[PDB]
Amino acid sequence: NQVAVLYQDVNCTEVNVFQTRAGCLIGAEHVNNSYECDIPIGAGICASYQSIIAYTMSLGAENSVAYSNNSIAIPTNFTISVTTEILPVSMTKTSVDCTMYICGDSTECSNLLLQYGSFCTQLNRALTGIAVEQDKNTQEVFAQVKQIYKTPPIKDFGGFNFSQILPDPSKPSKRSPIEDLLFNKVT
Amino acid sequence: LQYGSFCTQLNRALTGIAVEQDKNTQEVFAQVKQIYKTPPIKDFGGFNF
Amino acid sequence: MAYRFNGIGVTQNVLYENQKLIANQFNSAIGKIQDSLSSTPSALGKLQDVVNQNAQALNTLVKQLSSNFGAISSVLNDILSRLDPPEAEVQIDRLITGRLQSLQTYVTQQLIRAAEIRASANLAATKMSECVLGQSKRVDFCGKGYHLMSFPQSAPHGVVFLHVTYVPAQEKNFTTAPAICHDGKAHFPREGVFVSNGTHWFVTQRNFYEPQIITTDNTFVSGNCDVVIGIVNNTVYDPLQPELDS
Amino acid sequence: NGLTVLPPLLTDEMIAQYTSALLAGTITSGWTFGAGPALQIPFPMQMAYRFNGIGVTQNVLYENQKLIANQFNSAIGKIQDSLSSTPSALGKLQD
Amino acid sequence: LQSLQTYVTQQLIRAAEIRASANLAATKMSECVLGQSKRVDFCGKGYHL
């Protein structure tokens, strides 16, 4: 429950007191060591909970390659690596009735609105364009094959196991375990 | 205060821009986590850097 | 998978002679993917960011209906049933202008966010074409390392790519030379590199250590031993020589 | 009037340090440090690999090494002079 | 309020443009500095070394 306070663009003499280029920092204790950034303060200054400390951040470790005019390094083994990448594809399709929002069910308000011309039609057209764009996005990402392919019933691929990404027949959703976890983790 | 929450919207948009700038710089320049150094003697077969 | 090892510059025998180890590494990596997804909450923050931004925009739009914008009240029914048309017209004009301005701001921000989402979806379509339907040579486009393959998974309003790559490991130092001098001729490797462990000279492929005897089948000759800087003397074996010897 | 400017998180000296690390990595180890551990290699051999990349044999580089190095050095010097002598070079950042 | 809203909308448009430029720069740093590119005219005129 400990906190520190930063006052921006203020000198420390008009308000564990530290004067940075971002402002005046109260509640943090300044150290001469350098770590990776945890909470960015600014101008190269970061803060961390170790009490609360403020430090200049390090860019990384130091490494010097043993360069020579006749030396080489060759790998003798390898590693297989698997990594993830998440990308958003679409938004939710939302429609707004201009007259209902702006006037409700009153008629006098609508008669007065008719003096503003064609604003509501413009707004409706813009939202409709967004709504069709979303479906276009999903088509362009996912419908890249015109044949539905299935995997053979005997899963003999030379020792490689794909059960965590292939559909689960037990579930009613016919989703893979990883897809189940992904759909459960987003609220 | 009778106009509602316009000012909060404007501040939120500007804060989003300010965060995006630092994200841009990180994505361009911070592509290595090791700091490499050249050898003290610069003999690269005739190439001058 | 042997074809894909060829695609990154490694021979097929390297895959066929290590098939079980590679399969086990692949299976362990997929298992770790599942564990990491199950144990880390902030992994899917981008989709959650999109949802949160849209929801808070709608909440702000609905909340704006409680403002009076300089009129007597924010309720149309009360202001109509409390006043005559001559002044109700002016007050309703105030309300109408305020609500129209709020609606226009909402629509403008929605258009800008839609443009950003469209750029992201174009990138995802390019990745589905070039990492899932092929093997990519571009650096860091389909993961960190040398790209082998990729697998897609679907997520709410999004896509997840599992990139499988090759990473070198356990490197070792050797002495190297640009060419070999033999019989007053200069020899260069067809597809590898000359290496020396201190005593003997071999030729390896460049991404995996597998030394061979230097013969006339894995080298080609060009010029004499006078021009190249750093050439080394060593013998180049002739595979046809012992054949006619007997 | 309520206007203020926030400082960037990375200072100019830290961006310069990042670029110097990238230069040192590519000069001492080629493209290997971008895909795993950095593996040293002599620079003329790396340039021979890069000639192989565009469809030219290695002996072409090993037999013209001094000429190629001189051409490279002259090109870099001309880059420096051209930047120093033309004002409209950096128009985009100024815009 | 009108003046402030105009300023903020213009800033949002410009920020989108700058973000696109920075994404291009990040792709170039990955593919021309950390590797050798086969794409025509992506890392200069000629055959990229």
Side-chain angles (χ1 to χ4, degrees), chain A residues 1-8 10-187, chain B, chain C, chain D, chain E:
Chain A
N1 283 8
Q2 297 182 256
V3 301
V5 190
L6 179 69
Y7 300 87
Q8 293 155 25
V10 170
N11 193 358
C12 275
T13 45
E14 293 83 3
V15 62
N16 275 3
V17 170
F18 188 39
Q19 179 68 58
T20 70
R21 191 169 182 266
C24 192
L25 183 60
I26 306 193
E29 190 276 331
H30 181 237
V31 297
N32 293 302
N33 314 82
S34 279
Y35 316 94
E36 311 290 281
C37 196
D38 191 18
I39 304 161
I41 305 303
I45 306 297
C46 299
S48 188
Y49 189 68
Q50 67 100 32
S51 62
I52 295 170
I53 55 164
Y55 52 89
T56 303
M57 65 182 179
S58 73
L59 293 199
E62 294 293 328
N63 186 21
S64 184
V65 167
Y67 181 85
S68 161
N69 65 340
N70 61 330
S71 300
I72 205 163
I74 309 287
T76 60
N77 209 357
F78 52 84
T79 303
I80 300 304
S81 168
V82 181
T83 58
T84 55
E85 176 161 28
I86 295 90
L87 280 168
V89 172
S90 53
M91 300 189 296
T92 180
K93 298 156 66 179
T94 298
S95 187
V96 179
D97 195 356
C98 178
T99 303
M100 294 299 291
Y101 177 78
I102 204 162
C103 288
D105 54 325
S106 163
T107 63
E108 312 90 2
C109 181
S110 46
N111 300 121
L112 289 174
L113 198 54
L114 272 56
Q115 313 302 137
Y116 288 92
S118 61
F119 276 136
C120 286
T121 306
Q122 287 189 273
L123 305 174
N124 296 351
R125 178 181 294 130
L127 294 185
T128 302
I130 293 177
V132 302
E133 182 183 358
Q134 298 321 292
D135 285 323
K136 191 191 193 339
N137 288 349
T138 306
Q139 295 297 110
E140 276 151 358
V141 173
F142 283 104
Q144 289 197 1
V145 66
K146 65 178 72 66
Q147 310 261 348
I148 301 296
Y149 298 104
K150 279 181 163 60
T151 186
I154 304 298
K155 304 287 185 290
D156 177 26
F157 304 114
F160 294 85
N161 197 313
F162 303 106
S163 67
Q164 296 314 106
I165 59 175
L166 285 179
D168 206 336
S170 175
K171 305 297 184 179
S173 303
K174 300 294 187 291
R175 269 201 296 260
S176 79
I178 281 169
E179 281 176 333
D180 287 331
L181 189 153
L182 288 165
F183 269 74
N184 274 357
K185 282 211 83 65
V186 169
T187 56
Chain B
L1 300 152
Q2 291 175 354
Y3 289 93
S5 63
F6 274 133
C7 289
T8 306
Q9 280 200 240
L10 303 169
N11 278 348
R12 185 184 297 124
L14 291 186
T15 304
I17 295 174
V19 174
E20 195 161 73
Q21 297 322 297
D22 290 326
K23 189 192 191 340
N24 288 346
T25 307
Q26 280 263 328
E27 283 161 332
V28 173
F29 285 103
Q31 288 197 358
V32 296
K33 299 289 94 175
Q34 296 294 321
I35 305 297
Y36 301 102
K37 289 190 177 296
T38 48
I41 301 299
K42 308 290 191 291
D43 183 25
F44 304 116
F47 292 84
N48 197 0
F49 303 107
Chain C
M1 192 58 80
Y3 284 18
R4 297 182 182 275
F5 275 26
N6 277 136
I8 56 155
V10 183
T11 55
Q12 281 179 341
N13 62 275
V14 177
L15 185 136
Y16 284 127
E17 287 158 0
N18 303 302
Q19 183 178 330
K20 184 175 185 292
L21 169 70
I22 294 167
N24 287 348
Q25 285 175 355
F26 174 83
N27 294 343
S28 302
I30 295 288
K32 293 187 286 185
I33 286 296
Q34 188 147 8
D35 292 349
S36 166
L37 281 177
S38 189
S39 293
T40 302
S42 59
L44 287 80
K46 299 172 70 38
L47 315 177
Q48 205 66 62
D49 189 358
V50 178
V51 162
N52 289 354
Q53 276 182 286
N54 283 350
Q56 84 179 108
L58 273 178
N59 283 339
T60 295
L61 187 76
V62 169
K63 184 266 183 184
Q64 276 295 94
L65 284 177
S66 177
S67 291
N68 60 9
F69 301 102
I72 305 307
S73 295
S74 57
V75 184
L76 265 191
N77 291 332
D78 292 9
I79 191 166
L80 285 160
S81 59
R82 187 201 307 211
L83 289 181
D84 289 338
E87 70 279 18
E89 160 151 356
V90 176
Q91 310 303 301
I92 286 164
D93 177 72
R94 300 292 294 165
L95 281 188
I96 278 175
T97 53
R99 288 164 179 195
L100 189 82
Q101 184 178 2
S102 301
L103 206 49
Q104 279 189 355
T105 51
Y106 174 83
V107 168
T108 298
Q109 71 171 355
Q110 285 291 114
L111 283 164
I112 292 164
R113 286 176 188 168
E116 174 179 10
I117 288 288
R118 187 182 59 241
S120 187
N122 284 341
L123 185 66
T126 306
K127 306 237 176 190
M128 179 84 55
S129 294
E130 286 178 34
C131 310
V132 175
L133 265 56
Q135 188 182 23
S136 187
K137 284 291 218 316
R138 300 164 62 188
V139 173
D140 291 329
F141 191 62
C142 318
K144 171 56 73 179
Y146 300 112
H147 176 239
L148 291 172
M149 68 203 306
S150 294
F151 300 117
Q153 298 284 272
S154 60
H157 294 300
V159 64
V160 177
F161 289 109
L162 307 192
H163 302 301
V164 183
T165 63
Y166 176 103
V167 185
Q170 292 177 249
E171 65 274 7
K172 174 167 206 296
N173 287 321
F174 308 95
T175 300
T176 189
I180 297 297
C181 182
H182 183 68
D183 301 335
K185 302 191 297 294
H187 309 257
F188 304 86
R190 289 190 192 275
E191 49 197 56
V193 63
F194 292 136
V195 293
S196 167
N197 65 345
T199 300
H200 292 327
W201 285 91
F202 308 99
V203 58
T204 48
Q205 60 183 293
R206 301 168 182 172
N207 297 298
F208 190 77
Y209 185 52
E210 188 181 272
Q212 304 292 322
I213 300 295
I214 300 169
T215 74
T216 60
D217 296 0
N218 44 25
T219 61
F220 68 93
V221 54
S222 174
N224 63 6
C225 303
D226 189 359
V227 187
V228 180
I229 299 152
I231 189 164
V232 173
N233 288 119
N234 199 81
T235 186
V236 176
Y237 170 65
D238 191 334
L240 188 153
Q241 183 63 35
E243 307 309 306
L244 75 163
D245 190 24
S246 308
Chain D
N1 296 113
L3 304 179
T4 184
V5 169
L6 302 165
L9 173 58
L10 290 169
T11 62
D12 288 327
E13 190 276 331
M14 303 201 293
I15 293 165
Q17 176 152 48
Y18 271 134
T19 62
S20 84
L22 288 160
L23 277 152
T26 189
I27 279 163
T28 56
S29 75
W31 55 76
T32 63
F33 79 112
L39 298 174
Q40 76 263 8
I41 179 168
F43 195 78
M45 302 203 58
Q46 172 198 150
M47 195 52 80
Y49 284 18
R50 294 181 187 273
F51 278 23
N52 262 336
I54 58 154
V56 183
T57 57
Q58 277 183 340
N59 63 277
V60 180
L61 187 153
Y62 283 128
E63 287 155 359
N64 298 306
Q65 182 178 333
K66 295 181 185 293
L67 168 68
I68 292 166
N70 288 345
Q71 281 176 351
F72 173 80
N73 295 344
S74 301
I76 294 290
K78 292 186 286 185
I79 282 296
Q80 187 149 9
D81 291 352
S82 166
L83 277 176
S84 185
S85 88
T86 299
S88 176
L90 287 79
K92 296 176 67 37
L93 311 177
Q94 201 68 63
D95 292 357
Chain E
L1 287 176
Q2 295 298 109
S3 303
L4 208 52
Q5 276 273 0
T6 294
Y7 172 78
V8 165
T9 299
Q10 296 297 112
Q11 285 296 285
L12 288 168
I13 307 294
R14 287 175 193 173
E17 183 178 1
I18 283 293
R19 186 184 57 242
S21 187
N23 283 341
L24 184 62
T27 304
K28 302 235 180 187
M29 178 86 59
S30 292
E31 287 178 36
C32 312
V33 175
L34 264 60
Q36 183 178 22
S37 190
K38 282 288 218 316
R39 300 167 61 190
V40 173
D41 287 327
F42 189 63
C43 319
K45 306 293 184 184
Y47 302 114
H48 174 243
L49 292 170

